[PDB]
């Protein structure tokens, strides 16, 4: 079986691993390739802080609820293991702050220890009169990409730097199965008008006294257009910007100041914090994830395609459940092939 | 008014500050000295992680409940201020773990967000079937000593390195008021058989993915003889040893291994963590704090003495309420002097 994963972000590498770990057998061996135009540390996944948390609204496909929970349970079963260091996996507690009342999320029993904030906790944040507290996980994005690549190489997967211009390009090289994990750029291989970039920009800051995440919310401007502070293992991510349809991969002054002046109004200790770096990235925003089979009639033959893209602001949050579902889809392909 | 504080740990420096900040006036100026045998970074206070948390039993003098709460409120009013960095003040959440059920502490409404752990949280710790979660404060001990010394120098307080052998030694130099803040060594100036060292030893570890405190409890062996993990601003303190009556200021192998093997059974990620340093210190264990006036008939005159010692494993936790009470006691001295 010749398999080609297009993509080397979280979705592509985890799907590569999950296909091998379930379907490379004594009876059927797989050749799994990974073709990518950019690899770690140069991907969207490497920009991300990596906090597990879905959207505040219930998801469009409600299988995404399951897939997110599956991913949390996978990571919670490993957080206290000594190799958690290598994945970049750790527990964090902290705050979700709202101006007004809001109902409980469709994930509150997935996280540990979920509660509303007391008035005394709310008194710590003058701008915010409602909110939650819970404990979740961070899975650091550069670390997990490093570790996944290691696991893949160990299992004989080969990596190749190339931009694929078409599915037919792979198919004439003899891909029996193409796994399409190309994120926000998937429209270049097949037109998808439902897929758009939600551009974000972030600051990494030196503030190691920060031990909680602090997410604020302005639902009028939607998810991600309100300040957030996220302690990572070495550095704190400061963020809170979303532009639908901006394709500029460039850090800018206005977005810097929006984040700086916003996060320093959240937590004034950040005014002292050394700025270490700044990054820009594109969330693959889609109404739902596309996690789907398609069969492609390109040239002298047909080829089977597993699509796995469109994971928005939640791709680390949902990756493992998506990779196992894409593995399920690969098993259907093998069943049809007999 | 000639005042001499004996001691330059948290209790002596904060009491020095509080006396000046309340009673050095236009009408009555004070000369406040600080005599100490050791200063920062070489004191008991500098060893301490600095987590705010009293004992699990209600305190012997129940004014110590008030004094501890006063100290929490003082520090919570400042934790989000940009100068919190300089004091070493920050919020931390985390776990108090018990083998069996235990009733709620006499401080649970002082901390923010106090709750029992859920079964799912308890499932994270196999050895521990009961426990609490809450948010508290750390006040880093070397940092606050640095900052206090700065405030004192700024206000004209002078520091002198000397071991005082007697209260009469100070009194013949013309101390009108002696403030005795000598911790576990107070017995050398006046016999106190109720004061004993509770020797501890600690490891500082590089584990910056640790964002919660994790305290375990074995009430049979008492407070402090069970593993604890405490994320500080740069390094995580690993500890959990108490010896009543050990005066050996020396780190040892057995106590190292007790802590290492204990904290790594709590949280196996620590097996990867780089050990940065190790320290030994003596808690000034007494049945209650001595926070009291005495008048001393030494030589050609009498002298007024404020005692402020015996703060056990809770001296950072209670310091501010004790310093203000010792200030109250100084006001009584000034009232008697007219
Ligand atoms: C600032 C920011 C912060 C975020 N924080 C979080 C968070 O805390 N938690 C969370 O759960 N999520 C977070 N996210 C979202 C998360 O980063 C994304 O959902 C996730 O990275 C998408 O992963 P992916 O593998 O689909 O895409 P990408 O990681 O962008 O990888 C796509 C891959 O496809 C390759 N590719 C594309 N087109 C081609 C082609 N034609 N030929 C060959 N290769 C191609 C690329 O080179 C690349 O290797 C954040 C996103 C941003 C922007
Ligand atoms: C390992 C460890 C961890 C701890 N962690 C915590 C924690 O997380 N939270 C918390 O609240 N507490 C904690 N504590 C307890 C806390 O450290 C003590 O209660 C506190 O330091 C006592 O402060 P002090 O000023 O009374 O004494 P010290 O800081 O020991 O200072 C005494 C001063 O007196 C001077 N002195 C003594 N005798 C003389 C003399 N004859 N002449 C002149 N100077 C003299 C000394 O030189 C010194 O300057 C911890 C203690 C230990 C040992
Ligand atoms: O793209 C992204 N994903 C995740 C994060 C982490 C913080 C966060 C999670 C969930 C929401 C919420 F509730 F609005 F959905 C807000 C903020 N940041 C990003 O830029
Ligand atoms: O001496 C000390 N003081 C404080 C600490 C911080 C952790 C701690 C607080 C309270 C208890 C309890 F609940 F048992 F009292 C146990 C552990 N460690 C020390 O060595």
Curated annotation (Swiss-Prot), chains A, B:
Cellular component GO terms held in the UniProt record: cell projection; cytoplasm; cytosol; extracellular space; peroxisomal matrix; presynaptic active zone
Cofactor dependence: FAD
Outcome of mutating residue 219 to L: Increases catalytic efficiency and inhibition by benzoate
UniProt xrefs under SUPFAM superfamilies: FAD-linked reductases, C-terminal domain, Nucleotide-binding domain
Temperature dependency: Optimum temperature is 45 degrees Celsius.
Function noted in UniProt: Catalyzes the oxidative deamination of D-amino acids with broad substrate specificity. Required to catabolize D-amino acids synthesized endogenously, of gastrointestinal bacterial origin or obtained from the diet, and to use these as nutrients. Regulates the level of D-amino acid neurotransmitters in the brain, such as D-serine, a co-agonist of N-methyl D-aspartate (NMDA) receptors, and may modulate synaptic transmission. Catalyzes the first step of the racemization of D-DOPA to L-DOPA, for possible use in an alternative dopamine biosynthesis pathway.
Subunit (UniProt): Homodimer. Interacts with DAOA; the interaction is direct, can occur in the presence or absence of FAD or substrate bound to DAO, and results in a complex containing two DAO homodimers and 2 DAOA monomers. Interacts with BSN (via coiled region); the interaction is direct and inhibits DAO enzyme activity.
Disease: Schizophrenia: A complex, multifactorial psychotic disorder or group of disorders characterized by disturbances in the form and content of thought (e.g. delusions, hallucinations), in mood (e.g. inappropriate affect), in sense of self and relationship to the external world (e.g. loss of ego boundaries, withdrawal), and in behavior (e.g bizarre or apparently purposeless behavior). Although it affects emotions, it is distinguished from mood disorders in which such disturbances are primary.
Protein name: D-amino-acid oxidase
Gene: DAO
């Amino acid at each position: 079986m010749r398999v080609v994963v297009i993509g080397a972000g979280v979705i592509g590498l985890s799907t590569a691993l999950c296909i091998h770990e379930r379907y490379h057998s004594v009876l059927q061996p797989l050749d799994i390739k990974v073709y990518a135009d950019r690899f770690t540390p140069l991907t969207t996944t490497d920009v991300a802080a990596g906090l597990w948390q879905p959207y505040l609204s219930d998801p469009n496909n409600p299988q995404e609820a399951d897939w997110s929970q599956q991913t949390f349970d996978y990571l919670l079963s490993h957080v206290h293991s000594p190799n958690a260091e290598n994945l970049g996996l750790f527990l964090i507690s902290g705050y979700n702050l709202f101006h007004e009342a809001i109902p409980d999320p469709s994930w509150k029993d997935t996280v540990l220890g979920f509660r509303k904030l007391t008035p005394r906790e709310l008194d710590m944040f003058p701008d915010y009169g409602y909110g939650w507290f819970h404990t979740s996980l961070i899975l650091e994005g550069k670390n997990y990409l490093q570790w996944l690549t290691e696991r893949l190489t160990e299992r004989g997967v080969k990596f190749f730097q190339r931009k694929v211009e078409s599915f037919e390009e792979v198919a004439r090289e003899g891909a029996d199965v193409i796994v399409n994990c190309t994120g926000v750029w998937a429209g270049a291989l097949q037109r998808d008008p439902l897929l758009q970039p939600g551009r974000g920009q972030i600051m990494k800051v030196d503030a190691p006294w920060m031990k909680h995440f602090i997410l604020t919310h302005d639902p009028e401007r939607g998810i991600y257009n309100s300040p957030y502070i996220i302690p990572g293992t070495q550095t704190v991510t400061l963020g809170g910007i979303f532009q639908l349809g901006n394709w500029s991969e460039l850090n800018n002054i206005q977005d810097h100041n929006t984040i700086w002046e916003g996060c320093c109004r959240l937590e004034p200790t950040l005014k002292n914090a050394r700025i270490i770096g700044e990054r820009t990235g594109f969330r693959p925003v889609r109404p739902q994830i596309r996690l789907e089979r398609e069969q492609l009639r390109t040239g002298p033959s047909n080829t089977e395609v597993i699509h796995n893209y469109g994971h928005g602001g939640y791709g680390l949050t949902i990756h493992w459940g998506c990779a196992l579902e894409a593995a399920k889809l690969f098993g259907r392909i093998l069943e049809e092939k007999k």
